[PDB]
Design a protein that fits this description.
The structure is a homotrimer. By secondary structure, chain A is of the alpha/beta class. Chain A has one domain: 3-Layer(aba) Sandwich (Rossmann fold), CATH 3.40.50.1820. The first copy, chain A, has ten helices and eight strands. In chain A, strands 1-2-4-3-5-6-7-8 form an eight-stranded mixed beta sheet, sandwiched between helices. In chain A, helix 2 packs across helix 3 and helix 4 crosses helix 6. The relative contact order of chain A is 0.16. Chains in contact: A-B, A-C, B-C. The complex binds the ligand *CC(=O)NCC(=O)N1CN(C(=O)CNC(=O)C*)CN(C(=O)CNC(=O)C*)C1 (2 copies). One ligand ZIZ sits at the interface of chains A and B. One copy of the ligand *CC(=O)NCC(=O)N1CN(C(=O)CNC(=O)C*)CN(C(=O)CNC(=O)C*)C1 sits at the interface of chains A and B. It is classed as hydrolase.
Chain lengths: 272, 271, 276
């Protein structure tokens, strides 16, 4: 399936099953395929599951412009409009946690039932004047330098810290191959611009505007997006939010802790 | 090229050359690209060759619903009508042998000139109460368990028994990379649903409805689709079918025995 | 993005940025992604960059017919008509240097401001009765034989001489993986047909019809398209052409000499006028 964004960008999405809708937002470098196990899980258990490829990623068009959170949220808004979804549970991984939040911030929660933030960059990732505990900006500057040199090798190297393979997590050669294959479909321009986006976007104002049930899951061994200054604070700022911390879990915990995540997601959807 | 199916599914295909049309139906985990050598071979010899990516595979859409042989057959039906084909030679590999057979069963043979079944699941793969010699269903349930955990590694591990690498067949790392690349395009849901499909679907009634010249080819070293209870039986059930057995050949003989298959396909067309 | 060619083939393209248009034509086995770095460099510096997947490659359709330089040229002409481009700088790598050259010969240079030939097959790759210095046709016959047995392995093996890895160039496994992944998207037919095309197509007539400022860049360690009988000769045959030779550079110098190429393209786009 696809739909056309306002600026003319074609976005690829999957729409599986029937019942209450659940809309997934993927992380940096990936596409909708990072959700396949979670989507299959819930759709054969009576839910409708929807995942899209962010502009510049996967099977979607690769525009030069609009590689910003504001546009990402608006893309999501249009997907929901195109499908006429109601009572939507928004699920965001990594940087994809930003755009599900930014959606609610910009469009309200009229159509939203709940929110799930998986190892998300909310509320801030990068360091600010009034947020020194964040990740220094020279880290992300070093990313862009290597991306603009050899992004193929960078993605390949990203696998080890991402999955926590350098810390005794066992991930198959297949998953490593699949991760790199998907990553290479993406736009070099979108890859680099996203760094800027997720590094410097402040979602603290968004945190105040979330007025739906919220589940925050984060690994305490996450080497990419540090729990202490992201997930932990997100659960504090969002009213009535629940937190679950997976012990020793890495960034890419949708792979390593797949069964745990599937059950937590289902439990959340069945609340009260 | 693509067409839009009844339910709205977009299906990618290739239409090469001109002449007598030959329509290819690919196996599990693969796509239209597995046919590339056969297609170039025949089309550069004055045939028209057509191959589609099955729903949920390759460059086609990935619908939740319709992952069954009845729908698979209707998809072929729609392709044929889209291209206004007549005197088609249906060629099917593995589970792809199912939907070509079901097509003939559902729509009749008016547009069909011939049928070729390559290491095909027909007439019946999995075990039934009235088919005890079939493959026990738990074998396929074990496939589902692994696929629902890590399909990426499953595909990767599948290369060895598929190609007969574990029996001293020679396949490059190139082919192995391409097989995994093509496989990873596929829908998880479609991959799983297909096991149910090829495991439990009965094509015995379909065998009676095949009224066209048929060539059955199967390798006797096949570690995936057992020759003894499929291909051997298919040739017996289809009226006037011809059987060729490739000695010690694996399931993926389209690769290992490519030249022989190319020659046998040409020979059939010139019957 | 895509457009529909005359025969109904759909061709994928990228159209990035604003400014004077730069139109990239990729080489054998590849697609528009080989240009990502050049495209990002130029588009962040005031230029509009456009790159298509040749028919039978990348994300484009894979037709049986029309895998020849005439159609290739017409495909470029239809893209230019579709976006209504003017003052285009045509940039072609390897076999893609042939299709930009043929475009100019067929359609003229009304909409063309300049031409850049990178490791191009121009003016002639394969041997001829009146061009014995070309690569003997037996070599290309051998290519097809192998491609028609196992193209997947051929591409994988091709990485070494393509990037000059066998001569101590440093190329990451990532790049090697990317090159093989992209190449596998392509049609078997297009792959083989292109060999016939680049082996036998004579662009010598075309050279005489190129009336625009031209930059020829080639590496003098090129193992695929030999400098001495291609780039070196193109620089003589096209009137007013500028030549730049990258020392010990391989065929795939857009990877190994990325930064050098980027600055060379920008310099060329920013050139001044001459008096004639
Ligand atoms: C399989 C098929 O019918 N293909 C043609 C087709 O689907 N369309 C409809 N289009 C789209 O769906 C565009 N994308 C979205 O709406 C997300 C528009 N079509 C084309 O773009 C045709 N031209 C090219 O593909 C270059 C036709
Ligand atoms: C630069 C280089 O040597 N590249 C080869 C390469 O990276 N691959 C990709 N593969 C893997 O990474 C294997 N998996 C793991 O290491 C977890 C697959 N490759 C091979 O296995 C090479 N040989 C064969 O496939 C026969 C190639």
């Amino acid at each position: 399936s696809c739909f056309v964004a306002k600026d003319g960008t074609q976005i690829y999405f999957k729409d599986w099953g029937s019942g209450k809708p659940v809309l997934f937002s993927h992380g940096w470098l990936l596409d909708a395929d990072m959700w396949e196990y979670q989507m299959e899980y819930l759709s054969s258990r009576g839910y409708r599951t929807i995942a899209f490829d962010r502009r510049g990623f996967g099977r979607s068009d690769q525009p030069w412009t609009g590689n910003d959170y504001d546009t990402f949220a608006d893309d999501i808004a249009q997907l929901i409009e195109h499908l006429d979804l109601k009572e939507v549970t928004l699920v965001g991984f990594s940087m994809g946690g930003g755009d599900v939040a930014r959606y609610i911030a910009r469009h309200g929660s009229a159509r939203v039932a709940g929110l799930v933030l998986l190892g998300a960059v909310t509320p801030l990732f990068g360091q600010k004047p009034d947020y020194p505990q964040g990740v220094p900006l020279d880290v992300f500057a070093r990313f862009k330098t290597e991306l603009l040199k050899d992004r193929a090798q960078f993605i390949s190297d990203f696998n080890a810290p991402f999955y926590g393979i350098n810390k005794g997590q066992v991930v198959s050669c297949g998953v490593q191959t699949q991760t790199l294959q998907i990553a290479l479909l993406a736009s070099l321009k979108a890859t680099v611009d996203c760094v800027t986006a997720f590094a410097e976007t402040d979602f603290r104002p968004d945190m105040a505007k979330i007025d739906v049930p919220t589940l925050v899951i984060h690994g305490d061994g996450d080497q990419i997006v540090p729990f202490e200054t992201t997930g932990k604070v997100a659960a504090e700022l969002i009213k009535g939010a629940e937190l679950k911390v997976y012990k020793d879990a890495p960034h890419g915990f949708a792979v390593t802790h797949a069964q745990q995540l599937n059950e937590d997601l289902l439990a959340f959807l069945k609340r009260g």
